[model samples]
Target: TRTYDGDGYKKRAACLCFRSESEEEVLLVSSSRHPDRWIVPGGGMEPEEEPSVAAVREVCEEAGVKGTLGRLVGIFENQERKHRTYVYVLIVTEVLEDWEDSVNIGRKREWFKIEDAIKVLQYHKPVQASYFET
Candidate 1:
């Protein structure tokens, strides 16, 4: 069973996996449901899991990166999906040759400049695109 908050919003965590402290480049993964589109790595939270820890785990499993998990970017609420995503900044330290989603679903990942990442998401994932807003 999935975890849910008191408000019944599904608990979720995501990371803006940056290539360095410069935070200029961010990592994105090909969408599992729509292979042509890219998305930030994230997933539903597990029972008793901290959102911050889950953010790191999701990025590892989805984007295949290990990183120094940084500050909470924000808690984004998507009323349309009933999801409350805890978004964090992660400075990627290591990238794996292979990972869970890659093996299970033929998933792929890429690095993009911040503006380009937002442009890619704007068409298909506007909510995620908004995470980059000031």
Candidate 2:
């Protein structure tokens, strides 16, 4: 972990939503408005929202998926951004029955196999490592 001078802070959360039946699962999404990179859906917490609640809400809002958050995968300190992000492993029990209304925050949604996603996308190394550890 790295340390940084106290300045300002940004808070965010992300989840690795996966199926218990298979380890090869992957989640897909259209590029976010701010960044064009395809990513697993998640974002910042609103004021007064708990990190866990924000984590779950982001998944539903961004991906149209619902599940129980199993555990905290990692607490990553983004030195450059001056933020602390908590990542979680979400046990997805069901994907929405429809996709017509799924896309949100300027993106589409899809799921891919884990191996395929890794090969095609550039993921944050520490974030990926946290998934494996969890």
Candidate 3:
């Protein structure tokens, strides 16, 4: 996860997302409690846990996918959350049939074409910036 030392406040988080080479699709999940926006599967790290490990665990918990992260996509600051989120471009290798059981926290899951997904979501700037602009 990324950390910012500015203004005497230190915050950190991790994020995971991916794009497939054979398709224009991207995976997104809507939070069960907050369905206004669809997000890539991930969350903050546990105490003393590695950020990458947290990221991978999030994918399994959030989307039921098992994969390894490829490389760092760089860090971004969520001004509203007051935290720096480390972004990783994951290389997905497998998916489970019942990835989301009763314990999954998301409202629902969908695979959307990148362009369509971006058009429908407002918080997609960071992702678009990372994959398309960067």
Candidate 4:
């Protein structure tokens, strides 16, 4: 999902979520603002909270997915706002069919195989960035 500008993104938190229920899979959620495009479940970081912490919490809140998170994957810079979005790859330990945002905002959740992920890495650049985490 694409980010907005009015908020003046100072230090937003987002992630690349994945799980291994049977086979390796990547988790994705469509943006409530832009239902057509997909973005890893994440949002603004809490005051004084680490970006990684907010990243995991947002996954649970937005995507209903939980897992362990690794170190910093990378940072996406929005030059206009000079904003820094902290990116992390959260390894999904458990996954659910739906989360709090199930239908309220046209959010859709899905898991993608590595091959499929690579096939469409452009669609979800955050997931693409996850590859560098490992």
Q: Which candidate leads in TM-score?
A: 1
Q: lDDT tens digits, residues 1-134, model 4?
A: 43434656666787677675343677767768777766656777766787788888888888888887766767776566556778777777777665678845557887777666655546545434444344
Error of model 3, residue 71, in angstroms: 1.1
Which residue pairs come into collision in candidate 1? none
Q: Largest lDDT belongs to which candidate?
A: 1
Candidate 3 residue spans exceeding 4 A from truth: 1-16, 100-106, 123-132
Across 58-112, the per-residue lDDT of candidate 1 in tens digits comes to: 9989989998988998999889889999999999999998899999999999999
Model 4: worst 10 consecutive residues (lDDT sum): 124-133
Model 3 lDDT per residue over 1-134, tens place: 53335563333433445556543676777755677777666666666766677777777777777765767667666665565556666666786666653255434667777676666555544543344234
Q: Give the winner by TM-score: 1 or 4.
A: 1
In candidate 2, stretches whose alpha carbon ends up further than 4 angstroms from where it belongs are 1-7, 34-36, 97-106, 123-134
Cα-based lDDT at residue 113, candidate 4: 71
TM-score of candidate 3 to 2 decimals: 0.71
lDDT of 2 by residue, 1-134 (tens): 22222455667777778876464575656655534455666668777678898888877777778887777877666666566777787888778854433533445666667766564455543343334443
lDDT of 1 at 99: 94
Q: Residue 116 in model 1: shift from native, Å?
A: 0.4
Candidate 2 vs candidate 4: the TM-score winner is 2
